[PDB]
Design a protein around this ligand. Structure first.
Ligand SMILES: N[C@](CC1c2ccccc2Oc2ccccc21)(C(=O)O)[C@H]1C[C@@H]1C(=O)O
Ligand SMILES: N[C@](CC1c2ccccc2Oc2ccccc21)(C(=O)O)[C@H]1C[C@@H]1C(=O)O
Lengths: 738, 750
């Protein structure tokens, strides 16, 4: 049983013609869609190839097509005939020269012959072999395929979820190579798309609580996970939907080719699956093949040995009257549009034959140009050269495809795989009827029709257990699932350092809404703290008042001392209010010594005519020495005022000892003057009134302490001190007017 | 050509009989050691097997032995004859039924036939293939070997370095499967033994300056890595030593099976490679094989087709061609012209291993039957390989030391046991020769005392020295640390990272050194040396003055309305105040005592002010106590806010920190005393303006200078010095100032 027809080159064909019909236990069954249909597709291509005038003109291509019986072990023994021929060793059935093998539908079959043909360097193009193992070129060195591997569906399904802002996916793989290997790619693909997996459920051919269990393992755990990424086989997908039907589940299944566009998956229980998004392989039916295939007739098809057996099984009749098994075939029986439907993967079978033909055609030009036939160099073929140099780099457009200006580009990648073109289907309800409808293609980039896709909720569903969080809600704690954390509003006035964790450098004053704000305390001014105390200015008013008093003003001794004190008192308010300028408080303390010195001079007069000048210098010297002692080591700078997370102000020196130190010098002078005023009853006693006002000012000096604690409020003491200075000066001038 | 003899179940064999002889382009010669010798071993074993009675008695083993010609591609088409046995598809040499194949030789050959025979489920035992790739049971399922893979050498060599504490090593591999696939295993093995590679050369070319610079790379990069782990091929190992000889370097090479006991590697330039350590597979020569092989005769060995070709090539004659000689009849193989091949033990073991599995299967699948029953008419490779062949445990045949580690068994991957022989190049007087100094079966066992080294001493190859006593500041030279001393008396958490908390404070090197209170501020009169004498002198002066007032009264002097007693009482109280605070400085209340001392000094000054306010005695006495209360009220108010405490005395260095008091509080206390001193200063001016009173005026004027001097001394007293030298001196200065005030007060009473 073999289609061995002669030719300059001969191609090997491996098709599952018998659905374990030669297995001797599942015997008596041949495959129609995956068998003769795909087989005759290759023969159809070969007829076109050898009659084509632009692909191998002088080279007539024969075939050596064998049956794999859908069993890897049977294929291995069969495929040896491709090897037995291309080696160095009455006799009949002279061996051929298999240039390449176009065969292997079931990946288990296509793997066990990939191992064999690799050793003897025979290229192999395999339609319909989408297993991801075959992409491992370390083992299957000489394997190419016109169909994409099954892990490209993982990429497309991941892109579909990522497109719709979807996360928290629950995946339900299936036992076997298909479900398990495919979901590994999807699990890997979800990470790179920042898609997190709620549940990693798995199913098997059990038909037990497992199916009902798997349904609730997603309804119960994370009901926020509304999208379910199926990667199950065909029969498994139906039985899971049956399980979901009984419990009346409501999900938006994002399924793989195993579900596909088959209506038999949802035959019954459609509302539970309504809104699902399933993928299917992209394939444009070959128009010419139907004309060729429908014209087949056992009375004109003698190349195919299985065709006579196919005719019997197709129509359940007998070509010979000796059987009469329920019917005898008749001459008007034929293949027509009603009893036939083109297989989904006929496009890939034709491409596989053409890809081999194109590679052989190109190698015919390079190896020996200007040679219509095949040269003696062509008489020996090398697998490594034919595979990597030409076959693994061909770029011809697909034949028999009406839409040439489309994705009809036949080309193998660096792994010999397909290009990965899919059709994003979507189960839809028209109101009383359910039917699939293509809603998007996936060549390399997804392209959907969002406004024509029915969902299960009649609105675009979202699978979220945590909404995204912003510069508001900066932190991120993860109580349950790794992906949907709970964001926490960061302690106010903070520092972002990470999305997960967020600390606080400057929780008191002036950060940014980003990773920048940390104690960003711009300095204030001389009167910056009392910007809006409510009390602006008023320092020049004391100078104006002092100027008016000076304008109003025998007893030249009082004028000499009183005039200096009035001027110094006014300057204290300006220096105190408006780092170097922070030392003006020393002058104000020295000014009070002038009043004390005058009181001491007045006390001496009441109790050395030339000693008055020396006495003033002696008193002035002490004030200067004290200022130099303190202003020398400390001072000349300003100290900040960082409160308990209130704000940051770069004020003057926070050392209150300078005020206390200054008051000490005045206190001694004031204390001495008060003692003299006690005996000043013999105008007399006017100093006592001025001396008494100093005691109140001394008490007012105490309010400065514990008064500067209020920012911009302690400055009233400086204004009060200036006011106190005016009162003492007013007492001296008040007596004179009377 | 093949030895296709019949049998109940027949084995297959692949041997490199022809050194690419069929590939006449490469070399037409045939292998003798790896070829006929190994082949005849298989035939010798089969003759032994079928003549036994406790291993396949009724099952006569046959052979179908083919020549792999030492090329894998030629082996594949040859091995197909084994494959065609199990195919269900007018004359016909009918095929046999190959239970298993005993062959593979070169790993490249064995890999290709492993792929082919894996598909058709035929077990394969390789007597010589040792590539690490064949241990991957995912690709070569039905493959077993009686020799260990090549990565066990990497495991064995790494254990030699670990045993000898060598940690910083350089490696020099070759190009190809042997050099690469092994050295990567060694590099992985180095991690588990905490070993890092100084430099990893990959000199694999035939002969270029790559080896010359490779020796330089050994010299330049890490000269402190004296031992170098070679994993490179036999011919390459020869030229590397020659390169090392030219530069006249000196290392202690740790080689592999590539450079084993082959003296041809060091033929010439023995001294440069002297002291090396070389591994080599452990194989015991088969005594019975020598009698069989030497007794072979081209007139007796008609089974072997290549024997006539072997006879001609071995003896360089011809049996009939005009060769250099006609093959004489009395030529025979003897000990002079024959040395048993190293791997003959494994060839016999491989045949016996397959025969043992088939016998054990016969005892199970066909019990109570001396022949093979109907079940064995068809054999299943999967069951035979996975159950019987992969779990055999028979002791090696023809082994002299029975019961030793010479037991044939396959591990989970169908590999050999892994026995090696650690050799060492010796200096035997004036001659260099190899000698076994160890054996790595599965744990290293070395004759560590009888091994000669290049430097005549057990060498060490390290780029770092152990900095255990000090220098817990290792810098990671890569993988070897650079130890830096930790700063004097600083904290530590890890020898790798000294985190430098408190340098100069805590004197413990055991992961400490930061602030831990290493000093005490207590100083009993400067250790009773300086300043302590002044404390006792204060009491002596008071006793004389106290008695003097009573003696003068018993009044003889001016009555003064008891003013002298009030002034004397204040003077005594002030003098005792300074001594009391110093005597108890550890207590927290000592700071309060120092603060109260200033009030006593003001009290003595206050008494002078009351005395100065003489020009109403009862009113003056009451007024005097008012000043003390005013000073006491200020002290209580200011002291109440800080309360009782004893702050520390942190220092820039030396770790001199004493919890005595607050320096700022002392300055505040000193400033607080200034307020009382200010009143005393004001009193001095009043007294100056104003017989018996003349003496008081001089004392009051003198007291003013002492107060001014004391205040000036205090600001620079103990402020710029530590509590043991300057602060203690300042404390003594304060004590001296308090005593000096008593002297001024004493002068006034006189
Ligand atoms: N292309 C298939 C894919 C096949 C498959 C397709 C859909 C669902 C389940 C499923 O089972 C597996 C498991 C592992 C690898 C491949 C598959 C191939 O055999 O490679 C096969 C349909 C092609 C055909 O036989 O016509
Ligand atoms: N067993 C060997 C080992 C061989 C080898 C041995 C020593 C040095 C280099 C080297 O090159 C490689 C590289 C990869 C794998 C195996 C080897 C085989 O060829 O398999 C071959 C000696 C055995 C024989 O045929 O006598």
């Amino acid at each position: 049983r073999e289609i061995k027809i002669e030719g300059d080159l001969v191609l090997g064909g491996l098709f599952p013609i018998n659905e374990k019909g030669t297995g001797t236990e599942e015997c008596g069954r041949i495959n129609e869609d995956r068998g003769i249909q795909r087989l005759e597709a290759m023969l159809f291509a070969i007829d076109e190839i050898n009659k084509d005038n632009y692909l191998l003109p002088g080279v007539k291509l024969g075939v050596h097509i064998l049956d794999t019986c859908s069993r890897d072990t049977y294929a291995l023994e069969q495929s040896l005939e491709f090897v037995r021929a291309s080696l160095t060793k009455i006799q009949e059935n002279i061996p051929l020269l298999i240039a390449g093998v176009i065969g292997g539908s079931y990946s288990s079959v296509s793997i066990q012959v990939a191992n064999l043909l690799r050793l003897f360097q025979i290229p192999q193009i395999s339609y319909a072999s989408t297993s991801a193992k075959l992409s491992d070129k370390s083992r299957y060195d000489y394997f190419a395929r016109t169909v994409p591997p099954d892990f490209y569906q993982a990429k497309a399904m991941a892109e579909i979820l990522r497109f719709f802002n979807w996360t928290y996916v629950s995946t339900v793989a299936s036992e076997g190579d298909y479900g398990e290997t495919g979901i590994e790619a999807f699990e890997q693909e979800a990470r790179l798309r920042n898609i997190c997996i709620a549940t990693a459920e798995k199913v098997g051919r059990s038909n037990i609580r497992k199916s009902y269990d798997s349904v609730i393992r997603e309804l119960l755990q994370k009901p926020n996970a509304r999208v379910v990424v199926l990667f199950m086989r065909s029969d498994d997908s139906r039985e899971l939907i049956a399980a979901a039907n009984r419990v009346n589940a409501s999900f938006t299944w994002v399924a793989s080719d195993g579900w596909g566009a088959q209506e038999s998956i949802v035959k019954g229980s459609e509302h539970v699956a309504y809104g699902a998004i399933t993928l299917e392989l992209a394939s444009h039916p070959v128009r010419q093949f139907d004309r060729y295939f429908q014209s087949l007739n056992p009375y004109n098809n003698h190349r195919n040995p299985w065709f006579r057996d196919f005719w019997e099984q197709k129509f359940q009749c007998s070509l010979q009257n000796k059987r009469n098994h329920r019917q005898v075939c008749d001459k008007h029986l034929a293949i027509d549009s009603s009893n036939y439907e083109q297989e989904s993967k006929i496009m890939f079978v034709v491409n596989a034959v053409y890809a081999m033909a194109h590679a052989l055609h190109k190698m015919q030009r390079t190896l020996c140009p200007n040679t219509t036939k095949l040269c003696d160099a062509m008489k020996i073929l090398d697998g490594k050269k034919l595979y990597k140099e030409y076959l693994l780099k061909i770029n011809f457009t697909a034949p028999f495809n009406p839409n040439k200006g489309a994705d009809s580009i036949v080309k193998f990648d660096t792994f010999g795989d397909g290009m990965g073109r899919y059709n994003v289907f979507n189960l839809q309800q028209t109101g009383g009827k359910y039917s699939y409808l293509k809603v998007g293609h996936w060549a390399e980039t997804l392209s959907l029709d969002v406004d024509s896709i029915h969902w299960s909720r009649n609105s675009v569903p979202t699978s979220q257990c945590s909404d995204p969080c912003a510069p508001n809600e900066m932190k991120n704690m993860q109580p349950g699932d790794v992906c949907c954390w709970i964001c926490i509003p960061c302690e106010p006035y903070e520092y972002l350092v990470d999305e997960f964790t967020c600390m606080d450098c400057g929780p008191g004053q002036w950060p940014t809404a980003d990773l920048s704000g940390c104690y960003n305390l711009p300095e204030d001014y001389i009167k910056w703290e009392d910007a809006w105390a409510i009390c602006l200015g008023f320092l020049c008013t004391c100078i104006v008042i002092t100027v008016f008093i000076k304008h109003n003003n025998s007893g030249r001794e009082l004028c000499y001392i009183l005039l200096f004190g009035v001027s110094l008192s006014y300057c204290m308010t300006f220096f105190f209010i408006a780092p170097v300028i922070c030392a003006l408080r020393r002058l104000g303390l020295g000014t009070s010594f002038a009043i004390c010195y005058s009181a001491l001079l007045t006390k001496t007069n009441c109790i050395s005519s030339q000693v008055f000048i020396c006495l003033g210098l002696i008193l002035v010297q002490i004030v200067m020495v004290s200022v130099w002692l303190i202003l020398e080591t400390p001072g000349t700078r300003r100290y900040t005022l960082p409160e308990k997370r209130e704000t940051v102000i770069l004020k003057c020196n926070v050392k209150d000892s300078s005020m206390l130190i200054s008051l000490t010098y005045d206190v001694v002078l004031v204390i001495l003057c008060t003692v003299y005023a006690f005996k000043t009853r013999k105008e007399a006693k006017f100093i006592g009134f001025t001396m008494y006002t100093t005691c109140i000012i001394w008490l007012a000096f105490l309010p400065i302490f514990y008064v500067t604690s209020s920012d911009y409020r302690v400055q009233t003491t400086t204004m009060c001190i200036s006011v106190s200075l005016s009162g003492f000066v007013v007492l001296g001038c008040l007596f004179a007017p009377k």
